[PDB]
Design a binder for this molecule. Structure first.
Ligand SMILES: CCCCCCCCCCCCCCCCCC(=O)OC[C@H](COP(=O)([O-])OCC(O)COP(=O)([O-])OC[C@@H](COC(=O)CCCCCCCCCCCCCCCCC)OC(=O)CCCCCCCCCCCCCCCCC)OC(=O)CCCCCCCCCCCCCCCCC
Ligand SMILES: CCCCCCCCCCCCCCCCCC(=O)OC[C@H](COP(=O)(O)OCCN)OC(=O)CCCCCCCCCCCCCCCCC
Ligand SMILES: CCCCCCCCCCCCCCCCCC(=O)OC[C@H](COP(=O)(O)OCCN)OC(=O)CCCCCCCCCCCCCCCCC
Ligand SMILES: CCCCCCCCCCCCCCCCCC(=O)OC[C@H](COP(=O)(O)OCCN)OC(=O)CCCCCCCCCCCCCCCCC
Ligand SMILES: CCCCCCCCCCCCCCCCCC(=O)OC[C@H](COP(=O)(O)OCCN)OC(=O)CCCCCCCCCCCCCCCCC
Ligand SMILES: CCCCCCCCCCCCCCCCCC(=O)OC[C@H](COP(=O)(O)OCCN)OC(=O)CCCCCCCCCCCCCCCCC
Ligand code: HEC
Ligand code: HEC
Ligand code: HEM
Ligand code: HEM
Ligand code: HEM
Ligand code: HEM
Ligand code: FES
Lengths: 147, 74, 241, 379, 144, 380, 49
């Protein structure tokens, strides 16, 4: 009886059902054409899903770890390179980036003048660090789980 | 103060006790329990019961008079 | 009329102490509410995810929520926009505010039905007697047009037109949609809506009853042991004379 | 050497619960006192787990309570044991006071007065807690009983504007009632500590009323396992009252949202206030009704000066036993009448019930005591 | 809040009368429009922050209710920011939609210079220089 | 006829503790801080009671309720800034209380010292969640940083942090449970302070000489009652001048912005009374090591009675250990300054040096100095 | 409501004893030419016309 009542009282303070329905919100389809960045409202944040081609990935593979503003190479952060997942939150003011802009054709912040990299790095600008990438698990390629 | 050792003064009293480990916890439960329950309720029923009897009488009469009062007069 | 008819006790499947709800009846009653009762009544406190594991599966409730438009927003351009629904969305309101509900229902406000069998004396008996108790008004009393006579409504003047008759909807599982069957199904669904914890509460109560029936004689035996050292005690007196 | 008698923290526990001399013949009624303490802890613990999700705002109080029941894991369990534990708290409290009246326990005057202070505090705590869910019955009961508390001329209207924090019951009243409802059980717990401290200078009473110093036993292990058994029986009753009839004692009208323009046909408090409510409307004057409620709850404080017998308990007083059970019957009738609307024949029954209540406590029991004293050839 | 501080009650009531406030819903069940009362808060220019970001070229104009208590320097910062709009130095490229204010952190603000000489006509015969306007609005924001 | 002061039971208790308590005659102004801590605790209860009458723990209506307290409730600004600056004054009184205990050898009252250590932990937790409560930018981001730092303990860190949050980030469940915990915790602090006073009145009080003061002892009334009144009124002078004249110097300005989960501030630092511990958790480039170092810094403050190697109690007659004590005090001051500074050159090396010096002084140098002083006094 | 004088005479002709709730109608209004009152139906808050 004591274990049951203590476990029930502890489990009451865990995340409730409305939070669970609002935490694994996005179960993506494959309605995104090759190259298009699209937006989601996940966990109160803009979440960007963009399709990529291996030509641009090999072009961005020539970015060295030593000369990065925050060191993160372009080969390990994604298991599927053709699908890229970003958080559309500026670290400077909290604005939204818009892709395929600039000399590099990356993300651009219209609030701010800063041109993010197309992989999500701060290429030129006073934002102190890059765009964060969440955790995501892989089912069959129509469906990707975020969390 | 009010601890064991100076509570009262008892003289000439002998008490006998057993262990709990060699006497039954329910020694003749029904055969000595039912007559003492009847004895206790026979001692207390004439003090306790008739106020609640007249509570039931007032409750039924009040309900009947209320349903009569809501009823109209043909 | 000041005197009021009371609803009788109907022999519900969940009437007993350990008898749970019938989840098939909950499913049929939800179909009744969606097809009929959702036009004027709201259930703001119940979501589409609450139906999963009770009367619908995951993909079924996902489709049933995806066939509902939900006003999402605000957009990046700063406006509201219609979207297909999802499992985290609640049941949609029929009206944006109570006064529009009053304007569309001849002044009377249709109540929110999330707690309507917990907020009435009689509960699902009252809801069944209200839905199945519609009749023509007796003589002497001549009620106003647009009102309806219902002896179970307090005051006997309901602003709700009778929504229940034979074959008011269909049933996907192949059940004859009569008046009483639809009313019974929607009353079961309303009881589930007021108490979603009902079956789990009764299971925990059964475990409680069995555990207490085990524990009470044992703890009583411990008391009788540790007090039977004292209840067999004998006292003697040795006056010196 | 031993920590039970020399360690300054374990010395208090040993003096209060382990080597405390207790009468060897006290019945199950005494267990009720410890049960009250357990209920207090239960309420406090369950109250804390209601406070991790409750939002004290008039827009989002009813919605927050529904979110507790429907979305919080086992939140329906915690809410309904808080409600039925308030009811069980008042049941145990009423039987505690009845034990105090019957067995002459009011001669411990300091313990009795700290008791009636505790009773006032728990009545106010249950009142503000019942206002907290912000349903129809919460809003309307709060408005009715505070507006009749406003009946004092030249003083009561400023006091009711100060209590409400505005023209009527609004969000300020709800938030300050939440703060008061949270903080009052800790003054209740401290007052229970003072209650026990004032008790332990003289020891408990016994059903015979005699000096039990000739035969006393330690509290451990006897009354330890006796109060454990009482706790188990109480938890049977409470969990039956939650898991099987969760709203039998409740009121269905509290399940609608608070509409300030929807006056219900009947307005009642909870059942444990109802008898005072029936003493409230037994007088057709607002000052008279409120002051009569104050005397109906403070006649317990007046009780130790209304004792006339040379004996203490009612165990050897049959006429005063009859008058006591007539008083308990009258209290039950008052509860039923306060549940009932103000119509015929409930008004005359309530008037005679309150008149007989005050006459039995004030007049008839000292007369019965002096009659039994004369009857036993000692006066 | 302006009565007993800056205006009389009839003056502030007349100031709030020129305000046009959303309210409702009416008996017909919809939003309607009314002149403002004394218990009406100061009107938001935009219904939501996304339209504010859309109209003002990306950047969000913040709520100036705690802006002297949410910036280091207080109203010295507000006075220095309003009066410090100068051209960028040599080498730095200023993007259109951004203006060089050295007191804004990052030195690239999204606010156009909002004040200049005689931008409004005072009702007490005060010279409407840019420094006078900045000092008055800094004192008002310190009060607010 | 009897004496109602010594026979009535609660009057007997207050006569034992407050009127006829044998106190040392020579205790200095450092002994006023326990009563200052008690009255500042009472001020916190009263001002928070009046603050919670209008506060609403809800992420849509918490900052707005705080502004409604400030601008619409009569004297709500006074009670609110009294509460905040009373928390600051409370931690000033705590620091001087523990410094009195460290200097004058009062930690040999071991159970009193450990009950105090538990009090200090409870007060720091209570003030942390109270600072979370107004739901500003700094409140939300400091709560986020502290709990992600807590998530580094192995195999139970993520589970414990998501159980504390009530979700997968700081949100409204965290705010409501933090309001509940902030409301409840000072009553547990008050009960533990009652236990603190219980243990101290059993063991007696300490004098600045560290000698047996039972040769010359005076009643508490009226001497230390009027001394405590003077100290309480001086503390009210300091608290009220810091409320009415400088209300916003011990906080940070960007707590006056609403909480934004997208925007992050550049300088995410806690309140000033946490900053020294903050420096310790940045003195190690390992998160588990930083968490462990923080909690065992407070635990070596708890372990201080076991490190006493001298044969004299107080530091009145021990000048080398006096020099080491003031080096430790100034080291705590620069730990506070480094915790108030960004992670930049040259603050990493200065913070590391401050941390290793603090732990070396507490652990190693002070008992060796006690041994040296005992040798120098020809003890051994 | 700005009432009418015929309504004033009709309501002043109303007997006190024949009314359900005992309250004087002349003392109900301060100025006899205007009516100022709560427009709330005492059932549930319907808006009257
Ligand atoms: C039934 C047939 C058997 C029968 O009649 O036995 C006679 C027997 C009485 O004979 P007895 O020789 O006088 O034995 C009593 C002992 O002297 C002394 O034993 P006791 O009765 O004093 O026991 C301690 C007392 C202690 O009781 C408490 O502490 C109860 C306190 C909580 C009361 C409820 C609180 C809430 C109330 C809401 C209204 O327990 C009870 O009163 C009943 C305990 C039942 C436990 C479960 C048994 C299955 O009956 C009982 O003992 C009653 C219990 C069984 C019914
Ligand atoms: C503080 C005190 C609070 C009240 C304590 C009694 C709570 C009883 C309760 O509800 O226990 C629940 C338990 C059945 O647990 P249940 O969730 O049904 O199944 C577990 C499957 N994972 O049921 C039980 O454990 C049986 C009932 C025990 C009653 C208390 C005995 C002491
Ligand atoms: C119902 C139960 C009635 C009952 O059991 O009555 C008998 C018992 C009196 O027995 P006693 O005289 O102690 O003799 C022992 C052996 N028969 O009766 C008792 O022990 C009853 C003693 C009083 C306890 C019951 C209190 C009932 C509620 C009182 C409410 C009013 C209190 C004041 C409120 C203001
Ligand atoms: C002289 C009496 C002889 C009785 C003999 C009975 C049979 C004896 C042989 C068989 C043994 C049976 C069991 C024995 C039990 C103990 C001894 C006994 O019988 O006692 C009688 C009992 C107490 O005796 P005593 O106090 O002397 O009676 C005074 C009467 N008032 O007294 C009684 O039982 C009488 C109780 C009467 C109570 C009447 C109450 C009426 C008013 C109730 C009002 C309630 C509130 C209503 C609402 C008010 C507002 C509208
Ligand atoms: C502070 C400024 C200096 C105060 C001062 O005057 O210090 C000197 C004083 C000497 O006193 P003493 O040697 O005992 O007396 C000789 C004869 N009267 O020395 C004293 O009074 C010593 C006692 C000082 C206690 C307060 C100073 C330390 C405060 C911070 C302690 C932080 C501890 C760690 C907390 C987090 C863990
Ligand atoms: C050599 C003789 C003593 C010094 C010169 C004074 C001579 C006076 C002669 C005439 C007598 C006048 C009256 C004397 C009064 C009492 C005696 C006195 O004041 O002595 C000086 C005093 C204590 O001297 P004492 O403790 O005996 O020396 C240590 C021996 N092993 O104080 C001192 O000795 C001074 C101690 C200074 C300590 C400086 C510490 C610097 C480093 C601090 C770092 C703090 C921050 C660390 C941060 C780390 C991370 C970056
Ligand atoms: C639009 C015509 C409606 C339909 C379809 C349903 N309801 Fe309704 N309901 C409506 C109104 C305007 C009212 C208020 C009646 C009044 O006179 O005030 C109601 C009321 C109810 C109630 C509450 C009755 C009470 O005594 O409180 C219930 C329980 C109820 N209605 C049930 C109900 C069900 C189960 C429906 C689906 C079959 C349903 N209603 C449909 C308007 C309308
Ligand atoms: C529309 C052209 C505006 C006018 C008129 C005023 N302000 Fe403004 N302001 C505007 C924007 C778009 C921004 C955001 C800038 C950014 O980089 O995001 C601002 C910002 C401010 C600030 C905040 C500065 C900071 O460091 O946070 C302040 C204090 C400010 N503006 C002051 C201000 C005053 C006092 C005005 C009246 C004279 C005023 N602004 C007008 C847009 C506009
Ligand atoms: C807040 C609820 C209360 C609690 C927690 C409480 C607690 C206790 C406790 C623990 C005891 C000792 C155990 C016992 O003898 O039953 C006790 C005894 C007592 N209480 Fe209370 N009590 C409460 C309410 C009251 C009230 C309202 C009164 C006054 C009517 C009261 C008067 C007494 C008396 C007189 C005793 C002595 C028992 C005797 O020797 O006969 N108590 N109480
Ligand atoms: C410090 C301890 C307590 C806290 C924090 C507390 C908190 C709360 C809260 C938040 C609610 C509203 C949630 C809900 O209604 O389900 C509530 C309701 C209530 N509380 Fe408490 N409470 C405490 C102690 C008590 C005590 C001791 C009593 C009994 C006197 C009590 C009686 C009630 C009642 C009757 C309700 C209304 C239940 C209902 O919704 O019908 N509470 N309490
Ligand atoms: C919650 C805050 C605290 C309160 C309210 C408190 C309260 C008190 C009081 C009233 C006294 C007696 C008066 C005095 O000597 O100043 C005292 C003494 C003492 N406290 Fe605390 N205290 C607190 C924190 C602490 C802490 C954190 C420690 C441990 C470092 C501590 C250890 C001591 C010691 C050792 C004494 C005795 C000193 C002596 O007898 O000279 N206290 N405290
Ligand atoms: C049980 C008594 C207490 C209650 C009811 C209470 C209640 C509150 C409330 C409602 C707030 C939010 C108001 C606001 O932040 O402007 C608050 C803030 C705060 N409380 Fe408490 N509090 C209590 C005790 C304490 C104690 C003992 C401390 C520590 C000394 C403390 C430290 C704080 C701090 C630092 C804040 C943040 C102030 C701010 O930033 O505005 N509180 N408290
Ligand atoms: S605000 Fe977007 S990068 Fe600067």
């Amino acid at each position: 009886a004591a274990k049951n009542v203590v476990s029930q009282f502890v489990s009451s303070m865990s995340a409730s059902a409305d939070v669970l329905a609002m935490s694994k919100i996005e179960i993506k389809l494959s309605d995104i054409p090759e190259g298009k960045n699209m937006a989601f409202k996940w966990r109160g944040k803009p979440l960007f899903v963009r399709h990529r081609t291996k030509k641009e990935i090999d072009q961005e593979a020539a970015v060295e770890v030593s000369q990065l503003r925050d060191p993160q190479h372009d080969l390990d952060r994604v298991k599927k390179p053709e699908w890229v997942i970003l958080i559309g939150v500026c670290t400077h003011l909290g604005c939204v980036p818009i892709a395929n802009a600039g000399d590099f054709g990356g993300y651009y912040c219209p609030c701010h003048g800063s041109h993010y990299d197309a992989s999500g790095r701060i290429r030129k600008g006073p934002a102190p660090l890059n765009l964060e990438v969440p955790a995501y698990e892989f089912t069959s390629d129509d469906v990707v789980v975020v969390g | 103060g009010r601890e064991f050792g100076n509570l009262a003064r008892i003289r000439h009293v002998i008490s006998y006790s057993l262990s709990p480990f060699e006497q039954r916890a329910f020694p003749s439960y029904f055969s000595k329990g039912i007559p003492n329950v009847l004895r206790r309720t026979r001692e207390r029923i004439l003090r306790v019961a008739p106020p609640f009897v007249v509570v039931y009488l007032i409750y039924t009469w009040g309900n009947q008079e209320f349903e009569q009062s809501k009823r109209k007069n043909p | 009329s000041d005197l009021e008819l009371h609803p009788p006790s109907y022999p519900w499947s969940h009437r007993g102490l350990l008898s749970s709800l019938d989840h098939t009846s909950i499913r049929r009653g939800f179909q009744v509410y969606k097809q009929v009762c959702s036009s004027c009544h709201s259930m703001d406190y119940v979501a589409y995810r609450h139906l999963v594991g009770v009367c619908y599966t995951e993909e079924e409730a996902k489709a049933l929520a995806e066939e509902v438009e939900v006003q999402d927003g605000p957009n990046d351009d700063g406006e509201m926009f219609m979207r297909p629904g999802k499992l985290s969305d609640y049941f949609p309101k029929p009206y944006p505010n109570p006064e529009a509900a009053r304007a569309a229902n001849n002044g009377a406000l249709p109540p929110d039905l999330s707690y309507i069998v917990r907020a009435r004396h009689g509960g699902e008996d009252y809801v069944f007697s209200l839905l199945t108790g519609y009749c023509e008004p007796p003589t002497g009393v001549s009620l106003r047009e647009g009102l309806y006579f219902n002896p179970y409504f307090p005051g006997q003047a309901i602003g709700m037109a009778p929504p229940i008759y034979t074959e008011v909807l269909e049933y996907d599982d192949g059940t004859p949609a009569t008046m009483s069957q639809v009313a019974k199904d929607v009353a079961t669904f309303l009881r589930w809506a007021s108490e979603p914890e009902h079956d789990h509460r009764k299971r925990m109560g059964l475990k409680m009853l069995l555990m207490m029936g085990l524990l009470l004689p044992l703890t009583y035996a411990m008391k009788r042991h540790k007090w039977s050292v004292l209840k067999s005690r004998k006292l003697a007196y040795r006056p010196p004379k | 050497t031993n920590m039970r008698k020399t360690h300054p923290l374990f010395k208090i526990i040993n003096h209060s619960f382990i080597d405390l001399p207790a009468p060897s013949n006290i019945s199950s009624w005494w267990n009720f006192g410890s049960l009250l303490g357990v209920c207090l802890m239960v309420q406090i613990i369950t109250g804390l787990f209601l406070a991790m999700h409750y939002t004290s705002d008039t827009m989002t109080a009813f919605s927050s309570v529904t979110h507790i029941c429907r979305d919080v894991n086992y939140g329906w369990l915690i809410r309904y044991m808080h409600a039925n534990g308030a009811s069980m708290f008042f049941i145990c409290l009423f039987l505690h006071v009845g034990r105090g009246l019957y067995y002459g326990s009011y001669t411990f005057m300091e313990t009795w007065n700290i008791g009636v202070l505790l009773l006032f505090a728990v009545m106010a705590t249950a009142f503000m807690g019942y206002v907290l869910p912000w349903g129809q019955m919460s809003f309307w009961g709060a408005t009715v009983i505070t507006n009749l508390l406003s009946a004092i001329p030249y003083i009561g209207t400023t006091l009711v504007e100060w209590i409400w924090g505005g023209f009527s019951v609004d969000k300020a009243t709800l938030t300050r009632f939440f703060a008061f409802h949270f903080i009052l059980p800790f003054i209740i717990a401290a007052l229970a500590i003072v209650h026990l401290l004032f008790l332990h200078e003289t020891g408990s009473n016994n059903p015979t009323g005699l000096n039990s110093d000739a035969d006393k036993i330690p509290f451990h292990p006897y009354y330890t396992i006796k109060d454990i058994l009482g706790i188990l029986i109480m938890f049977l009753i409470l969990m039956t009252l939650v898991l099987f009839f969760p709203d039998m004692l409740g009121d269905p009208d509290n399940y609608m949202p608070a509409n300030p323009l929807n006056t219900p046909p009947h307005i009642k408090p909870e059942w444990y206030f109802l008898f005072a409510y029936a003493i409230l409307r037994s007088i057709p004057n607002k000052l008279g009704g409120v002051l009569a409620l104050i005397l109906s709850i403070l006649i317990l404080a007046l009780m130790p000066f209304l004792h006339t017998s040379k004996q203490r308990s009612l165990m050897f007083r049959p006429i005063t036993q009859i008058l006591y059970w007539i008083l308990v019957a009258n209290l039950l009738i008052l509860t039923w009448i306060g549940g009932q609307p103000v119509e015929h024949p409930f008004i005359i029954i309530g008037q005679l019930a309150s008149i007989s209540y005050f006459s039995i406590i004030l007049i008839l029991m000292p007369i019965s005591g002096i009659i039994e004293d004369k009857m036993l050839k000692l006066y």
